[PDB]
Amino acid sequence: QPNLYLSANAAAVYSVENGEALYEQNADKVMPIASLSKLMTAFLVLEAVDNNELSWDEKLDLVRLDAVSLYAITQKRTWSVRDLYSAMLTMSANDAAETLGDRLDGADFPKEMNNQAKKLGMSSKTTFVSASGLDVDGKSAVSTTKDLFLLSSKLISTHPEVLETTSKPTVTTDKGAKLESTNDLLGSIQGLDGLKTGFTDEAGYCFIGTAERGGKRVISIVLDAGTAEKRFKDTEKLMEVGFK
Numbered sequence: 001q002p003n004l005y006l007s008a009n010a011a012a013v014y015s016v017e018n019g020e021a022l023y024e025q026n027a028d029k030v031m032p033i034a035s036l037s038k039l040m041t042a043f044l045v046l047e048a049v050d051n052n053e054l055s056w057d058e059k060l061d062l063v064r065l066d067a068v069s070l071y072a073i074t075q076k077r078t079w080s081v082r083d084l085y086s087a088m089l090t091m092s093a094n095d096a097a098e099t100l101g102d103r104l105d106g107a108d109f110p111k112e113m114n115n116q117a118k119k120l121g122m123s124s125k126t127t128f129v130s131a132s133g134l135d136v137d138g139k140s141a142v143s144t145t146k147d148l149f150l151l152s153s154k155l156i157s158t159h160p161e162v163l164e165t166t167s168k169p170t171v172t173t174d175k176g177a178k179l180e181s182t183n184d185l186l187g188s189i190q191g192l193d194g195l196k197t198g199f200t201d202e203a204g205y206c207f208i209g210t211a212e213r214g215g216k217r218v219i220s221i222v223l224d225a226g227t228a229e230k231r232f233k234d235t236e237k238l239m240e241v242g243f244k
């Protein structure tokens with residue numbers, strides 16, 4: 001049970017095969033999660049396509065934010081559902097995430113996120129507030145590492161194709177737009193193919209990682225590391241523990 005000396009305030013790594021913790025630090029602590037919220041949006045986008053309620057080719061106009069935004073970078077407002085989903089997962093474009101949630105359930109999308117959270121076994125310490133994880137009316141999206149593990153594991157087992165997108169260091173859209181991934185560990189740790197970064201002043205630097213080697217998948221959670229690099233340094237330590 002050796003200490004890792006992590007930057008993160010809360011961190012953990014779990015085996016997917018049995019859901020068991022291999023390392024835990026403040027695993028029950030309620031923590032701001034910010035852009036990690038986009039994994040729930042991704043889950044609900046994928047449920048919508050499967051349920052014949054959403055088309056990958058439907059074109060949508062980016063909602064305007066009050067943040068990293070797809071519109072500002074490109075000056076293009078109209079995007080397919082596919083590209084909005086890629087932008088949300090790769091570059092963490094808030095306006096992309098909010099456009100997807102609004103198409104799915106309008107104003108009622110946070111209620112749908114928390115409905116789904118309870119459905120996937122996440123504890124009542126989890127609260128989503130928005131499709132992007134941006135604060136809403138001063139309230140913040142919060143969760144625990146244990147709850148984030150359950151979300152991620154359910155997302156990967158229910159929709160394994162999420163990793164087809166999260167494993168790409170660059171997603172190039174059909175019309176040539178190159179969306180650069182925030183996951184700098186891709187191509188560095190063997191088997192790593194996800195999952196999602198986040199950062200606010202309050203949440204610090206966060207990252208949910210996942211890797212698989214020889215049938216064994218692990219999911220790592222890093223919350224409130226001190227720099228953009230340190231959340232990845234913590235992930236390397238956790239990923240070493242996960243495959244020991």
Ligand SMILES: *C(=O)[C@@H](NC(=O)[C@H](N)c1ccccc1)[C@@H]1N[C@@H](C(=O)O)C(C)(C)S1
Pocket residue numbers: 033034035036067068091092093094132133182197198199200
């Ligand atoms: C999710 O956490 C997003 N964070 C923000 O939009 C912050 N409000 C912000 C950060 C910096 C400047 C202005 C606002 C996105 N996820 C982050 C991440 O993946 O590390 C982001 C910086 C790419 S933005």
